[PDB]
């Protein structure tokens, strides 16, 4: 099946470079272009550029050209975007998308880039224990974004609210709530912090 799989969220230092990848599978790689799009709060969507693996040609938005190099490796069906001279303006979610005359039909999942001198800090996960019962999940003191929260390894999806994180004293915090009906039918939040490659499970007990 067609899929664009991006590299994980990552942290880079100011002034450094970073290389982000988009592995395309499920089609003949050279027959579609790969474009890159930046999403930053309050700034909508911006087009960065594209590479055409067939020809080797990359096009660049003039606003990005001095900080951006696009490449593609046909042998591995992977497109890359290298950003240089990084600043905090470059912190954003970056997508790749394929295109060959019918629009951006398939997208990558996005990759959050944070540009900062701060260290990676994994989350501390604390239980929020109490017809319908609400339980939850406090995910405190992590850096950088994002974390992902599931319940029961994704087998419990209905009645979940995962709130946006808030930044305080250079660390992020968020909470997740779940609601279920009141046997051996337990409840576990699963927290993943891709930038530290950490996963935590917390089984909620009364």
């Amino acid at each position: 099946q067609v899929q664009l799989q991006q590299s994980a969220a990552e942290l880079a230092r100011p002034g450094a470079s970073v290389k982000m990848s988009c592995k395309a599978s499920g089609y003949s790689f050279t027959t579609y272009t790969i474009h890159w799009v930046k999403q930053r709060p309050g700034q909508g969507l911006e087009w960065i550029g594209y590479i055409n693996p067939s020809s080797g040609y990359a096009a660049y938005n003039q606003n990005f050209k001095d900080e951006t190099t696009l490449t593609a490796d046909p042998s591995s069906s992977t497109a890359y975007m290298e950003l240089n001279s990084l600043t905090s303006e470059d912190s954003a979610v970056y997508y790749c998308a394929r295109e060959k005359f019918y629009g951006y039909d398939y997208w990558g999942q996005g990759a959050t880039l944070t540009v900062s001198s701060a260290s990676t800090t994994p989350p501390s996960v604390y239980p929020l224990a109490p017809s319908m019962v609400t339980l939850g999940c406090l995910v405190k003191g992590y850096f950088p974004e994002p974390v992902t929260v599931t319940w029961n390894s994704g087998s419990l999806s209905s009645g979940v609210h995962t709130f946006p994180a808030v930044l305080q004293s250079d660390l992020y915090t968020l909470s997740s709530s779940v609601t279920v009906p009141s046997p051996s039918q337990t409840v576990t939040c699963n927290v993943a912090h891709p930038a530290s490659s950490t996963k935590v499970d917390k089984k909620i007990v009364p």
């Binding site: 909508g44 969507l45 087009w47 629009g103 501390s124 604390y126 929020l128 609400t134 709530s177």
Partner: protein, 211 residues
């Protein structure tokens, strides 16, 4: 560059009604090959952008017939008939005719529905957190409407404003509601010196006693 301007900024719609979004290009977006590469995307909460329409008026496979695109010259329109809750999110137009390719600024479609009171829950700091020396008091206000809601903290009956951070979800595409967390973060020292903790949604009240 070709500037892409969308109207309106915010599009509240009641379920089952029609809606339309306008996209105006600052210059013509006809490619020299004769095609107009005007696309519409929908960014749903927590998802990558999804293609709706390409080449002005061509629905992408899997997109319902309720979505249609039209236009020429510099004014393009996305029409949605019989709006459903799953249609909420941010709609963007895009031109792929003239480099640099450009997106519109986005139109946020939201569902207008009947008012709903929040289901309020409060949680003292867990034992695990307290051992480490921190004290987060957490309150969930779930599945309410409209988005604007006031949360108020009281500590032994006195209003409390310092150390409160609020966070809202995007609109729920099942029931068109909103949810919010309010978190009072104290030092354990401070937490230990007070007994009653209240969160009030406006008045639905939940409290506990410990310290």
């Amino acid at each position: 560059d070709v500037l892409m301007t969308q109207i309106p900024l915010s599009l509240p719609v009641s379920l089952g009604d029609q809606a339309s979004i306008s996209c105006r290009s600052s210059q013509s977006i006809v490619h020299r090959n004769g095609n107009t590469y005007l696309e519409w995307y929908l960014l749903k909460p927590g998802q990558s952008p999804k293609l709706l329409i390409y080449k002005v008026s061509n629905r992408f496979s899997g997109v319902p017939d309720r979505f249609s695109g039209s236009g020429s010259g510099t004014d393009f329109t996305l029409k949605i008939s019989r709006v459903e809750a799953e249609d909420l999110g941010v709609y963007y137009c895009f031109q792929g005719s003239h480099v640099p390719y450009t997106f519109g600024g986005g139109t946020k479609l939201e569902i207008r529905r009947a008012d709903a009171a929040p289901t309020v829950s409060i949680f003292p700091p867990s034992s695990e957190q307290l051992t480490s020396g921190g004290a987060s008091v957490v309150c969930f206000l779930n599945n309410f409407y409209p988005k604007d809601i006031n949360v108020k903290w009281k500590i032994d009956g006195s209003e409390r404003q310092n150390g409160v951070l609020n966070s809202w979800t995007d609109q729920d595409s099942k029931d068109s509601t909103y949810s919010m967390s309010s978190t009072l973060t104290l030092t354990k020292d401070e937490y230990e010196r007070h007994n009653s903790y209240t969160c009030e949604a406006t008045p639905i009240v939940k409290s506990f006693n410990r310290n």
